[PDB]
Amino acid sequence: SLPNVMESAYYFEQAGVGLGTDETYRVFLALKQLTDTHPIQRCRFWGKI
Amino acid sequence: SLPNVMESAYYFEQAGVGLGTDETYRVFLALKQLTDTHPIQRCRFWGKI
Amino acid sequence: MDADSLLLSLELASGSGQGLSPDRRASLLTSLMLVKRDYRFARVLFWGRILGLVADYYIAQGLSEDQLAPRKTLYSLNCTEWSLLPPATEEMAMQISVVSGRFMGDPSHEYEHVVQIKEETRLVSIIDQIDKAVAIIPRGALFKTPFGVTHVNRTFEGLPLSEVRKLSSYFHFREADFLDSLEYDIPRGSWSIQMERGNALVVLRSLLWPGLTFYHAPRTKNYGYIYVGTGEKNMDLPFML
Amino acid sequence: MDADSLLLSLELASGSGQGLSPDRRASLLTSLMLVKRDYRFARVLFWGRILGLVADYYIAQGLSEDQLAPRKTLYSLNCTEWSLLPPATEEMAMQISVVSGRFMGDPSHEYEHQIKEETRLVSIIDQIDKAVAIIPRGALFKTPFGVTHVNRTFEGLPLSEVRKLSSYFHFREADFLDSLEYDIPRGSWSIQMERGNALVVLRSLLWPGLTFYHAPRTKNYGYIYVGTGEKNMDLPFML
Numbered sequence: 134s135l136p137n138v139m140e141s142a143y144y145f146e147q148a149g150v151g152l153g154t155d156e157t158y159r160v161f162l163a164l165k166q167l168t169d170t171h172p173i174q175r176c177r178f179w180g181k182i
Numbered sequence: 183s184l185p186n187v188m189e190s191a192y193y194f195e196q197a198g199v200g201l202g203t204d205e206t207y208r209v210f211l212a213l214k215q216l217t218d219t220h221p222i223q224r225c226r227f228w229g230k231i
Numbered sequence: 232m233d234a235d236s237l238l239l240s241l242e243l244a245s246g247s248g249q250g251l252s253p254d255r256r257a258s259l260l261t262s263l264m265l266v267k268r269d270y271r272f273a274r275v276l277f278w279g280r281i282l283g284l285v286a287d288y289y290i291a292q293g294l295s296e297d298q299l300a301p302r303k304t305l306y307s308l309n310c311t312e313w314s315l316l317p318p319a320t321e322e323m324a325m326q327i328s329v330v331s332g333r334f335m336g337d338p339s340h341e342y343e344h345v346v347q348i349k350e351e352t353r354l355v356s357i358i359d360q361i362d363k364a365v366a367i368i369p370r371g372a373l374f375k376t377p378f379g380v381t382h383v384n385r386t387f388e389g390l391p392l393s394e395v396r397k398l399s400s401y402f403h404f405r406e407a408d409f410l411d412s413l414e415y416d417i418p419r420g421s422w423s424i425q426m427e428r429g430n431a432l433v434v435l436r437s438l439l440w441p442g443l444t445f446y447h448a449p450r451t452k453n454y455g456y457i458y459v460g461t462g463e464k465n466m467d468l469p470f471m472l
Numbered sequence: 473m474d475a476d477s478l479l480l481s482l483e484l485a486s487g488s489g490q491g492l493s494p495d496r497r498a499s500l501l502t503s504l505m506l507v508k509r510d511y512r513f514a515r516v517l518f519w520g521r522i523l524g525l526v527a528d529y530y531i532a533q534g535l536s537e538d539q540l541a542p543r544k545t546l547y548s549l550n551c552t553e554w555s556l557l558p559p560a561t562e563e564m565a566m567q568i569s570v571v572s573g574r575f576m577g578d579p580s581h582e583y584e585h586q587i588k589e590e591t592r593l594v595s596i597i598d599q600i601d602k603a604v605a606i607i608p609r610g611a612l613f614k615t616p617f618g619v620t621h622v623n624r625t626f627e628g629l630p631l632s633e634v635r636k637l638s639s640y641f642h643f644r645e646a647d648f649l650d651s652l653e654y655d656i657p658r659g660s661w662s663i664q665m666e667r668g669n670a671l672v673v674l675r676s677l678l679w680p681g682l683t684f685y686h687a688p689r690t691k692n693y694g695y696i697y698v699g700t701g702e703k704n705m706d707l708p709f710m711l
Contacts, residue, residue: 139196139494140192143192146203146243146252146253147188147252147253147254148252149243149249149250149251149252149255150243150248150249150250151243151248152243152244152246152248153241153243153244153245154195154244154494154497155244155428155479155494155497155498155501156244156246156428158494158495158498159498181248188253195484195493195494196493196494196495197493198490198491198492198493198496199489199490199491200484200489200491201484201485201487201489202481202484202485202491203253204238204253204256204257204485204667205485205487205667207253207254207257208257208667230487230489235668235670238480238485239480239692244479260667260668261667261668264668385625385627386624386625388624428479429501429502429505431475431476448476451476452691
């Protein structure tokens with residue numbers, strides 16, 4: 134139930150923001166673990182504070 | 183007239199092939215030079231031999 | 232950030248969180264090395280980017296033969312269109328105290344106190360008051376020869392991991408084994424030291440100027456600093472820490 | 473290539489075209505770090521790919537303190553489980569002479585020309601490294617103790633002998649090691665430059681898929697074989 138975090142990160146790179154491909158894919162896999170763990174309808178990369 | 187070279191290059195990166203975002207963006211700009219120079223209906227990055 | 236190595240030196244992938252798009256980064260690489268051609272700098276370094284409101288200022292530096300004093304600064308609203316800034320001085324540093332807020336996007340823009348403050352003067356001033364007391368030299372990159380500070384350490388091997396957390400293994404770029412460390416009786420805790428990318432990257436953040444990111448790979452001769460932020464001074468730090 | 477360079481994605485900037493995907497890149501960074509953990513290698517370098525028909529082999533070798541020592545080759549099919557191959561031999565080089573064609577991606581596959589696919593993989597990686605594995609002049613200096621260490625002040629190559637094959641040595645036994653210009657057929661190494669003069673790209677023609685890179689005036693170097701995994705015997709027709 135994930136979004137395409139890499140497509141978003143690609144547009145983010147077009148705008149000159151994001152965490153880069155490596156760390157963003159790492160966060161994407163972490164969100165995948167979140168979806169595996171919990172019965173959740175959405176898991177959106179809100180941000181990095 | 184031009185194609186979306188960067189969306190294609192992003193999918194290329196995902197598949198693994200490509201020149202990196204940097205050289206692909208250069209190729210996109212060079213294709214734009216070709217497109218504004220010449221009266222082209224449709225243009226496509228064929229490849230790098 | 233050294234001009235030849237922005238594609239090597241990704242602040243955006245390093246955890247800065249804001250940085251250069253591939254369009255901008257491409258224009259920066261070719262335009263900075265041509266900046267080295269036109270004005271004969273020994274080295275060109277990308278300084279960072281002040282966000283502003285309407286348009287983004289992209290800022291670069293140019294260094295002569297090795298010294299900390301001759302630090303010419305540039306700006307460009309379309310990356311390639313580089314223009315040499317006037318030198319900074321205490322008069323323009325004093326003059327911009329009567330103006331606050333975000334940068335605009337137009338060097339010809341003028342504020343009102345009625346003292347007139349050109350956006351250009353604000354850019355040059357804010358650039359220098361950023362670089363004093365945030366621009367890191369890691370311990371060992373530079374020393375002082377007896378005949379002058381040139382001595383770019385060609386044998387530099389980075390900082391060992393034990394020295395990294397201490398904050399005493401980082402010197403300023405100011406005109407000071409010879410420079411003032413980041414511990415200089417500044418507000419204590421004004422630097423956030425972060426171990427990033429599997430302990431292969433030390434990310435330092437200036438909390439007096441948010442958006443300033445500095446890093447170096449440990450055990451390696453890669454280092455550089457960059458400002459991707461709003462351009463206003465965070466005086467507000469001691470309320471936080 | 474190095475892990476630091478795997479972060480940079482110079483595999484794709486070199487113009488090889490094949491390179492690697494970012495998912496695989498992140499997985500290699502984690503798993504090669506833990507290969508350096510489980511096997512106490514001085515360095516762990518990503519050698520590239522042998523492109524198969526069902527799956528692609530993902531290869532890395534282990535470098536001891538002596539960099540020219542016989543190095544322990546590993547393979548993976550999913551970037552995470554790294555399997556340690558056996559070392560190569562002359563006898564194992566002789567067996568696969570009857571076998572040709574694309575790799576399969578199934579290490580258990582058998583050829584009736586029996587030959588194991590591990591046999592092919594090990595001996596092909598061996599033959600590539602003996603024939604073609606570049607180092608620049610100045611890097612990998614011989615310590616007086618009879619052991620080779622990375623020259624920590626290699627400081628890159630200047631642009632004068634970047635263009636020359638004489639400034640480029642192999643990763644093997646031969647005090648300087650073995651120049652490329654004693655390597656036939658003449659012109660077997662292509663010489664190319666990246667954007668600017670920031671980096672020179674060397675593409676193997678006897679073994680297509682290999683693309684060694686090097687940044688002048690910088691200690692960043694490396695090579696990967698991402699290719700079919702066979703020797704281009706056809707080369708002197710083409711030159």
